[PDB]
Structure formats: C-alpha cells, structure tokens
Nucleic acid binder design. Sequence first.
RNA 1: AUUGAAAGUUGUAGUAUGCGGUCCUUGCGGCUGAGAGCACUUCAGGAGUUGCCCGCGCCAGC
Length: 112
Amino acid sequence: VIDPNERKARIESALKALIPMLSGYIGANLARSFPVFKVEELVAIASEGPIPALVHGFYEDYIEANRSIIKNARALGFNIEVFTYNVDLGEDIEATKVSSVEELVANLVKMV
RNA sequence: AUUGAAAGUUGUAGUAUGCGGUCCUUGCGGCUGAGAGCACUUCAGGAGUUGCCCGCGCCAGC
C-alpha cells in the first residue's frame, strides 16, 4: 500500500533497531545500573522466504543444532545467508565471519 | 173419613268355651383356568473450530 521507498526505509530502520540492543540498552534502570554488556557469540540467518526459527541460545549444545538446522535447510532448497560471530559452525558451511554487531546490520541491509 | 172407626206378631238371647299345621334333615362328597413363548434382530451424538491479537514494573531514590 505504501511507496516502495517507504517499505525499504522501514526495513532498514527495523534492522538498525538492533543497534541499541546488543550495546547494553535493554531492560530498565539504565540511569543507575547500565549493565556491563558484551556479546559473547551469535549466529544469524537472513534468507528471503519462510525459514525455521533458530534454536535458542539457552541450551548448551545449540551450536550443533544450529549447524544441523542450517545445512539441511540449505540442502532442502533454501537460499539462506548465514552470519556467524565467535562461532566456528564447521567449515563446509558458507558462513560470513562477522566481527561485530553493526557490521552484521550492514550485511543485513546490503541485501535489503 | 169409605167392609168402615182404634190395633209393634212384640220384649230378654256371645252359634260360644280349649287347640304348636308340629317333631328329625350337610343342596354334600372329588376337580391345576394347566402345559410350550427372546417385545428380539441392524444403529458413531458425528463432521469443521487458535482463548487469538496490542501491553517497559515504569521513571526521581549518595
């Protein structure tokens, strides 16, 4: 319904909304607490159509589950683009080794 | 009003006194309203249905 440029700008705004997410701007009591934040590791998949939800990082062996859910999804015929930070994720998987959070957002907005 | 004139055929009298139509007598004895009989046989309370969607326990706290 809206102009295509409006849709695009909304897309990059939503993607860049993650910049004040992994920097320590979550939760409440920011004035006094402002928690000591660091991103230990992360894995992201972009794709274009419907893809299965990634496994939560709560579990201890979620890296193996992520590898198994990525390789087989790509084998099934999904054009999934994978970005990894501080996660090996094997060697046979074409995954972009990102270095931070904002450049991950740059990679996401590259494919708009 | 004369073959006429006056002239009770009358008085008293229980056809009565007593006397069980009576005595004895099972309408009685024996007798299955009885024997055989599925109110049975076949039946989905069934198909479809998000208890959904939005939500800072929040901001000032030597």
